[PDB]
Amino acid sequence: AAVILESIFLKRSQQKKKTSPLNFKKCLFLLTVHKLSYYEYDFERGRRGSKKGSIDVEKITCVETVVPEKNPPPERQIPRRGEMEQISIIERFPYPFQVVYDEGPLYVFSPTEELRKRWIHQLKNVIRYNSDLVQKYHPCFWIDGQYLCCSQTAKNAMGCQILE
Ligand SMILES: [Mg+2]
Ligand SMILES: [Zn+2]
């Protein structure tokens, strides 16, 4: 299928336990009408590496922004307001979004506001006719065994905030 979008993002690793330290890894993300997939990026050869994951688009229930971390490390700090900077676009990833599906949320960090907007728009387009789209979501991260937004301790808990 034709690639709609291809980007390098920071993906948050699946937090195994409420005590497991959070890991963030750079991945190459591809979107088609059928799948959202992510790979290791082979920087030396300038191409995608091994596949790390794949989400069938029909399984996605929600795609929205996430409230950013309160005290992020410099790699994820939102810059002040004010052409593409080659280094910052592959080193700094301040803008998170979430992809909710059967196997909970996937958290992805974009280097720019515009790129995050592009992905959210295209994902909303490809999921438009899905059968299990939710009318509610969690605006905050699932962190250390609970949602920051509502303190619910189940990853599959119904969203606490109605989508406008
Ligand atoms: Mg290429
Ligand atoms: Zn919540």
From Swiss-Prot:
Coiled-coil intervals: none
Domain notes: The PH domain mediates the binding to inositol polyphosphate and phosphoinositides, leading to its targeting to the plasma membrane. It is extended in the BTK kinase family by a region designated the TH (Tec homology) domain, which consists of about 80 residues preceding the SH3 domain.
UniProt PTM: Phosphorylation at Ser-20 and Ser-110 creates a binding site for PIN1 at these Ser-Pro motifs, and promotes it's recruitment.
Sequence similarity: Belongs to the protein kinase superfamily. Tyr protein kinase family. TEC subfamily.
Expression across tissues: Predominantly expressed in B-lymphocytes.
Modified residues annotated as Phosphoserine in this record: S20, S54, S110
PTM annotation (N-acetylalanine): residues: A1
Chain positions found as Phosphotyrosine: Y39
Organism, scientific name: Homo sapiens
Zinc finger (Btk-type): 130-164
Subunit structure, interactors included: Part of a complex composed of EEIG1, TNFRSF11A/RANK, PLCG2, GAB2, TEC and BTK; complex formation increases in the presence of TNFSF11/RANKL. Binds GTF2I through the PH domain. Interacts with SH3BP5 via the SH3 domain. Interacts with IBTK via its PH domain. Interacts with ARID3A, CAV1, FASLG, PIN1, TLR8 and TLR9. Interacts with MPL/TPOR.
Residue ranges of domain PH in the record: 2-128
Complete-protein stretch covered: 2 to 169 of 659
Annotated transmembrane regions: none
Record's disease association: X-linked agammaglobulinemia: Humoral immunodeficiency disease which results in developmental defects in the maturation pathway of B-cells. Affected boys have normal levels of pre-B-cells in their bone marrow but virtually no circulating mature B-lymphocytes. This results in a lack of immunoglobulins of all classes and leads to recurrent bacterial infections like otitis, conjunctivitis, dermatitis, sinusitis in the first few years of life, or even some patients present overwhelming sepsis or meningitis, resulting in death in a few hours. Growth hormone deficiency, isolated, 3, with agammaglobulinemia: An X-linked recessive disorder characterized by growth hormone deficiency, short stature, delayed bone age, agammaglobulinemia with markedly reduced numbers of B cells, and good response to treatment with growth hormone.
Sites where the protein binds Zn(2+): H138, C149, C150, C160
Residues holding 1D-myo-inositol 1,3,4,5-tetrakisphosphate: K25, C27, Y38, K52
Protein name: Tyrosine-protein kinase BTK
Biological function: Non-receptor tyrosine kinase indispensable for B lymphocyte development, differentiation and signaling. Binding of antigen to the B-cell antigen receptor (BCR) triggers signaling that ultimately leads to B-cell activation. After BCR engagement and activation at the plasma membrane, phosphorylates PLCG2 at several sites, igniting the downstream signaling pathway through calcium mobilization, followed by activation of the protein kinase C (PKC) family members. PLCG2 phosphorylation is performed in close cooperation with the adapter protein B-cell linker protein BLNK.
Intracellular or extracellular location(s): Cytoplasm; Cell membrane; Nucleus; Membrane raft
Disulfide bond entries: none
Segments of this protein annotated with the region Inositol-(1,3,4,5)-tetrakisphosphate 1-binding: 11-23
